[PDB]
Design a protein around this nucleic acid. Structure first.
Length: 91
RNA sequence: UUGUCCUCCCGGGCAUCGCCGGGCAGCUACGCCGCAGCCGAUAAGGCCUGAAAGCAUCUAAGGCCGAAGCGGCCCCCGAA
């Protein structure tokens, strides 16, 4: 194990409410609702105060990578639900 | 229609069916009719999201397309 435990936090802005049931996380905001199932053996996701916490005991390199990508995905959900995304293409 | 025999005529036997021309039915080909391009998942490859590795990155987790190849539609045998 690279460390005793790993704990990644994702802050929740005022306009967004985040809920977790089992291994599936819901993010609701003024623009819509988003879902996703984040599963990895040993990683547990819960909401504490105003943050979403991805936590694991005695993680390894791959576990750390998985936790970081999960945090990035949750941040992407919050970003999309609170302003959304726009792509530009040139013909 | 040739040779021969039944005496001759008609009518017949044999000579590869005696030989030659034609020939329906049947069988045949050299004849004629019939043989779908659509769904599903993939290989190489082309991409999205994304960290390990505050950036980057098609890959580590996750997702989308993608072969005369693979599975189904189709045909034949099939209640030991």
């Amino acid at each position: 194990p690279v460390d005793a435990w790993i704990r990644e936090e994702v802050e929740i802005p005022e306009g967004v409410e985040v809920t977790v049931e089992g291994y599936k996380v819901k993010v609701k905001g003024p623009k819509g609702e988003l879902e996703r199932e984040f599963f990895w053996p040993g990683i547990q996701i819960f909401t504490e105060d105003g943050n979403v916490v991805i936590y694991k005991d005695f993680p390894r390199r791959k576990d750390v990578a998985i936790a970081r990508t999960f945090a990035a995905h949750i941040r992407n959900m919050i970003k999309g639900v609170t302003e959304g995304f726009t792509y530009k293409l040139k013909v």
